[PDB]
Design a protein around this nucleic acid. Structure first.
Lengths: 276, 276
DNA sequence: TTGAGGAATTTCCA
DNA sequence: AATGGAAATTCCTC
């Protein structure tokens, strides 16, 4: 529905936001999986002020993230994952030019709902812009927001319709960047703390040290553990790794980079090791 | 023609081989240009033993590079560039399920021909494998060879058919990273050699030194020439540049970075200059 | 169209 | 079914 709503006398809140990224899939591919949450779980929606003992139907559809008139995204449609097992929530498929998922919000769970039945299909830019009426374009526009709605019936006969939107979700298959290093060196034993000040640093970021021969033959590689804290979206706390040879009589130049998965390595950062 | 030939009593030789790479184009795009030669010119084909004063027709078609039964490539077709001007050779378009270009080989030029009217179209994998008969596949198979043929008529009535093939031609279309510096300093005069050990280093890589005021106003910038060798995919040989002021009575801190085009600069690398 | 360089979508694989 | 990883084929832009 293009009309905007909010959170009237009660309140519909997203208790658990979905990961910032989520590669969507095409009709040409097979499901690319449900929208997952950073916690390794799934996003969670909850209706608070409801006291009655009647189950409502939470509605889920994919909407726009940028611009600003929250509306169904023309190039994305929620996908009903048929989790023969993994699925913890029942589903239903409706329409209105855009597909909508309806999951039950039951008081049994304190009107709380785990969303692990929602995927993200991606229609083909051409196929869309090709239909009479649409003026928006797909190109470069792949940000999305999960939209949740509930239609609360009050004994008085009225219908209160709340709605909420997740944070933005990138839906396309963005690398790390280091600007400053808390420390520049340390000695063989390691231990000392190094705080990296940069960008794109996510909870899934990794830091690895490496040493190469003047040619390029990497002879050393070791992952230095990041930190227990949520760190920061632009700050990492790395515990300098130990070295492979404490018995050095001259400092040793090495490198360390930040990586986010596979094809996501930051430029090599310089770091030296002083002999005992 | 699937049948193989060679170089009988005369000889058909490629006097100038085509560059190893050449991004081909789709019917969906516009010509991506004629096949060019490393010399900046174009490939050149020549028939030697011919003495008669009659022009023959050199035939050009795109064939397979790998495997080994030199044959028309099913996913590539020569493209007749309509060089309203740049074109130095006339052309003709034939068939046989595969398109063939026929350029004239005239004695005026010593039966020599400059090939600057040949491009490389790329049919769509699906569109091909979809036709009854073909069993080969496009996927990962994008190597090609320019094939040239001549049909030499001998007064005796016979027909001698020679043929030759260019070297293989790749037909298909990420910032630098410095991990180690061979040298750390040098003095004003420069000259000394510096070997950079990193990644992504391509033949088109450049190295520039720079100096800035504590604010950021860059007052010095000079490109230090790389090296004649193919260097390495992870190793560069830079000849330290000269400095702008030999008359310094104190060392000077400067920087140097590796760049691949425009938006491809590596982090600034530290380097100092000692006074005479 | 011609002629490319540089990406962003779609399709494909293991 | 669910994804991670790429090749392919469109798309922009000048």
């Amino acid at each position: 529905w293009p009309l905007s709503s909010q959170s009237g006398s009660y309140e519909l809140r997203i208790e658990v936001q979905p990961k910032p990224h989520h590669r969507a899939h095409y009709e040409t591919e097979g499901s690319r999986g449900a929208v997952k949450a950073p916690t390794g779980g799934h996003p969670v929606v909850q209706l608070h002020g409801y006291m009655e003992n009647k189950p409502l139907g939470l509605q889920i559809f994919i909407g726009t993230a940028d611009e600003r008139i929250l509306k169904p995204h023309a190039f994305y449609q929620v996908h009903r994952i048929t989790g023969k097992t993994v699925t913890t929530t029942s589903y239903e498929k409706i329409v209105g030019n855009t597909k909508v998922l309806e999951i039950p919000l039951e008081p049994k769970n304190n009107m709380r709902a785990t969303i692990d039945c929602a995927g993200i299909l991606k229609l083909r830019n051409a196929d869309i812009e090709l239909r009479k009426g649409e003026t928006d374009i797909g190109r470069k526009n792949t940000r999305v927001r999960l939209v949740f709605r509930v239609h609360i019936p009050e004994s008085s006969g009225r219908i209160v319709s709340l709605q909420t939107a997740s944070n933005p979700i990138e839906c396309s298959q963005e690398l790390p960047m280091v600007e400053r290093q808390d420390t520049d060196s340390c000695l063989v034993y390691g231990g000392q703390q190094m705080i990296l000040t940069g960008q794109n640093f996510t909870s899934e970021s990794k830091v690895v040290f490496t040493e190469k021969t003047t040619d390029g033959q990497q002879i050393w590689e070791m992952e230095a553990t990041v930190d227990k804290d949520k760190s920061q979206p632009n700050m990492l706390f790395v515990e300098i790794p130990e070295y492979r040879n404490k018995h050095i009589r001259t400092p040793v130049k090495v490198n360390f980079y930040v990586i986010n998965g596979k094809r996501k390595r930051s430029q090599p950062q310089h770091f030296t090791y002083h002999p005992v």
